[PDB]
Amino acid sequence: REIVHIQAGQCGNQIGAKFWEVISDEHGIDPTGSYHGDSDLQLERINVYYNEAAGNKYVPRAILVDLEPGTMDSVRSGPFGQIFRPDNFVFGQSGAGNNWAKGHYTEGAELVDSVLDVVRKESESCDCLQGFQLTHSLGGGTGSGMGTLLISKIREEYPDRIMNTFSVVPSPKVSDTVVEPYNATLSVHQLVENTDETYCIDNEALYDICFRTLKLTTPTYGDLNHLVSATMSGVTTCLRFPGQLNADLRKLAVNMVPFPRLHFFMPGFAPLTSRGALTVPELTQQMFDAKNMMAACDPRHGRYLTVAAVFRGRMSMKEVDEQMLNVQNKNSSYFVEWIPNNVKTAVCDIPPRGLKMSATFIGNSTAIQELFKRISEQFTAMFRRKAFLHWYTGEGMDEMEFTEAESNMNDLVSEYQQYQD
Amino acid sequence: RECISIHVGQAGVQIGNACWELYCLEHGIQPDGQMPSFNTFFSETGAGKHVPRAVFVDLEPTVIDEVRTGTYRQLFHPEQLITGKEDAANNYARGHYTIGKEIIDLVLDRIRKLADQCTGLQGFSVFHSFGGGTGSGFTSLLMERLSVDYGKKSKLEFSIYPAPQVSTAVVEPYNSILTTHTTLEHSDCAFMVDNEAIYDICRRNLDIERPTYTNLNRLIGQIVSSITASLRFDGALNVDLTEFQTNLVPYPRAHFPLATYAPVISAEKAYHEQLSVAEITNACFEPANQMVKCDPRHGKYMACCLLYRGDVVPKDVNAAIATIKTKRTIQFVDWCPTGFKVGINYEPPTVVPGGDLAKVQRAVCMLSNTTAIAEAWARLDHKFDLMYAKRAFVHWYVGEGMEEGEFSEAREDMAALEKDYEEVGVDS
Amino acid sequence: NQNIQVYVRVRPLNSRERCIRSAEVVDVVGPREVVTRHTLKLTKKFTFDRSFGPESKQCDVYSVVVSPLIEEVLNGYNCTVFAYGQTGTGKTHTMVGNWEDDSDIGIIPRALSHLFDELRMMEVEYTMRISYLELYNEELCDLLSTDTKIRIFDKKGSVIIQGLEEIPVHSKDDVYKLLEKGKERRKTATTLMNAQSSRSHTVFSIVVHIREMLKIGKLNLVDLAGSENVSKAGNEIRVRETVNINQSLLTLGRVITALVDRAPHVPYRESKLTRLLQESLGGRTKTSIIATISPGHKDIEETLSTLEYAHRAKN
């Protein structure tokens, strides 16, 4: 019942920095590693995410990996940089410079042997492994490069564990680097085949959420990584804390994957409020809403396959499930016909600190073919010119491999249109 | 004169929290096991402790620790609280084969140990669901060996029926068809419970718009006390559970009754109506208090038990049971003229200190076999059939060790059950 | 073609089966329909495209099957046949037969006759290169020479395999040796029951370019493993073989149902076989599924499970 957590890329290590900040406060764990909470429930499932070291020390089950030290240089010097033992900081120099084959096909792969032994000794320390958990982006070099390479060796080594990851998707808004559609199409050639699930996340929808819901002026990277980390704890803490319908990640996995390639999700936090009511019908309307969709897709333009509704707090079941039933009753066209009940619930007894309730929308819609259309159309015009491709061909990548990447991606598009209507 | 109680799944275990909540309150038994200043569901130690005849087994280690760290942990013996390490993952193939095989050998010995401690075993009653992974997979594996080793014992199943509209997992119709094939061959009398009607009775007759799983199981635990824990005590007309299967199950495969409970009332409205035995028996036969969402008017009746509690004059019951045939809007089969077994125990209905059921002097639990259930099976069979038409979600099962021909096979035995419930009503 | 070639062949009785003196349970009517009794005692009917009884000649079961199938490979298109069944003497007698007597050989050397019958019939640039690869433990193993990966090469649907060893042979006994070379490196798993359990879905590829212009012809021989149960196996390594066998069959069983309903997007990438065999089943091709069986009372639950894999819904 323990989950390995690895953070890669400039994106994901920033996300996991705020993530472990939340979980430490979820149990009253000091930034040094000492327990100061007041509940046995804070005390019971520490082993799920931590290793109890002597003197009531708690080192998190977390491995930081990159090709450039500078992020971890800030983190280890920054707050919650002392909670890690310093063994976990597995990195090198000479970063990939947002080159996929540098992160995957070559250099970055040389660091991988140093990584997996630290994965091995951590997984050997687990008495009962339960799954793996990654944090990266798609359009990043050191995020997607080793991020595909690491999960390939692990699923070969651990064919039974749950392979979840939190994945930041390129937007129709920002092209930070122009090679971002080239990095996504190579990663989706690995993410479909080597994970059991993932979560698509856009920066742009979180820009929308802190603008139109939280009403915050300048949403920094601290705020969005605070925002995505709530759904990260929102997934797993029902397994840890007591609940009415306690559900494993595998209990999500058999509930959300009707076909073995479709495991991409749009998570969403329900009680997103500004500083200016709170019931289960209040929550589920925020769950249903397209503005709360943390992917840049119109889910009402798509259609839903399966919806996971994880809940937190003291809530009456019929108050949830009748309200859950009304969601299918209003827009029955929005769900697929060959699945009679399209939505799964899960209720944890314990809410997070401050709010008496919180829920988590996790959906598998047919709107995700839209975000696949952005990458493939951006793949097409760049591949015609072969524009700025000679770096990767200089790194040993063949055009057929890119052609086989996009067609396999185009295979994934053709599934969702098939199952939409 | 004793019976055993297994609890499996997250459902039937959490029900079993409420069952043993009644039986300790039945006799002034503390969570310790002694009475401050009856040998049917317990084993008394020499120190005056009474250990229950209960084993709690689950693949999830969560809900078991809620028992052995919360209350009643001084009650059960800790060798009984069998605990897995990894979840069922809501897979039948996990519970029936893949995971539950490596625990059941420990589980079967505890049943074999307690049956050796028992003398005059009446059988045992298990607690599970239908849409579950542990309470459908592992309990299917569980009643296989019990039918082998104990071929002569009564097997009772307090299963939770998958409701038509409100359902909590997408794979619930996929596991019910797998469960019923294992059930139909070996289970002697299996009760189903639909959760929507537990809401429906409580939001109208109990006037509670906030039911939790605690508030549902107090009703469910009250019925199981009425079937067994009353009937192992003195009464005017006591009936044993061995003669049930010859009273209630007319054929090999008809052993699927519906339980209900008529004096369900709040604390306030019991002050208005003085409950007689006449109006209570009518309250059992209401279509709105059926505890499983079916239309009893659209189904013929075969046999109907009426188990009683508290002060009851049987002369009034014979008028009251004649009143139902006088108020004949029920459909009764021409096979059976007199499908009305009365049983009156002298024990009163007991109150739970915290539940919202008032202290009534009399209580009636009604078991019944109707032909309305083929309508209920047809809903779950449609929910199955579209998913197998798409081969939806099946790779979590054939990736775990089942065959695609078997889900077609198990539907036909479910479909063979639908032929029988059509046959029993049409005959004249 | 629009109508899928759903077939089933019954093996004859063995002498050890006659030592038990067990009664037959199969009733032959014609080459189209053969009644399959069931004594438990309800005689059921299973209507398919064509059915071969226990007393059927090996050329005769081939001439109905392999002789309409062969020429569409050389006439532009391609064609594919499968071999589904459990371990049994009926499985070997279907494919290679005995082998002997130039007529009673299986579907393979009767085809290999009719290939080299075509080489002498008309004269073009016949180039007969052949690979032979299995799926053992979710990897495509070169049964001819496994000396790291089997790589798939794809402009509209045409899939080529890299790492395979195409051997340009031009006599009938050549691949007869290569199949012996195929079985020696094919992985088997020793067991108390069916130790010769060399359970692997396995392709056998006959690509013949017949150019003049450019004229290509590809023939595929699929050796499907039988669907098993992990409970009846009773083996504590063999399960990873077993559950990957059955899951590969159902994904293959999914896509054929995705063919007959004229579904817009047929999925392919989910299983490695139908990803490696995309255009062979999908196009204006003719797909013959074969289910072998042995009569009697032993494999009754194995018999009825094959009919569910053989039963198709029609208007």
Ligand SMILES: Nc1nc2c(ncn2[C@@H]2O[C@H](COP(=O)(O)OP(=O)(O)OP(=O)(O)O)[C@@H](O)[C@H]2O)c(=O)[nH]1
């Ligand atoms: N009345 C009642 N029903 C419950 C309770 N917990 C779960 N259930 C019901 O059980 C049904 C499914 O069975 P579960 O126990 O959830 O099965 P599961 O998800 O596989 O969990 P496990 O069986 O423990 O592995 C759900 O539809 C719930 O309605 C409970 O505490 N009280």
Ligand SMILES: Nc1nc2c(ncn2[C@@H]2O[C@H](COP(=O)(O)OP(=O)(O)O)[C@@H](O)[C@H]2O)c(=O)[nH]1
């Ligand atoms: N939310 C958030 N996103 C980030 C942060 N840093 C980088 N990203 C995203 O990561 C993407 C670039 O990938 P990056 O990790 O920098 O590539 P890499 O350094 O080679 O692994 C950009 O599109 C950013 O949106 C951060 O601190 N917060």
Ligand SMILES: [Mg+2]
């Ligand atoms: Mg459970």
